[PDB]
Amino acid sequence: SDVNECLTIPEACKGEMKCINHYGGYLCLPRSAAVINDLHGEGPPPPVPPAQHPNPCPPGYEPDDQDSCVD
């Protein structure tokens, strides 16, 4: 939320990640899997990551960035 205020709707889950498709379908998954850098392997991470978001949600359903200023 850059220009967005605390008026947003709780259509995202607190403690769970928001997995949505390009059609608008909504899903929530356990926050056990963190949305971090690419897991291409161990040791050195690449200068250009092939995945800015791990996509723990089945391909087609992309993780949405949930930024809230209040409950």
Q: Which two tokens stand for residue 35?
A: 């949305």
CB 13 within 8 A of CB 28: yes
Buried b (16+ CB within 10 A) or exposed e, 39-48: eeeeeeeeee
CB 28 within 8 A of CB 18: yes
Strand segments, DSSP code E, in the chain are 16-21, 26-30, 61-64
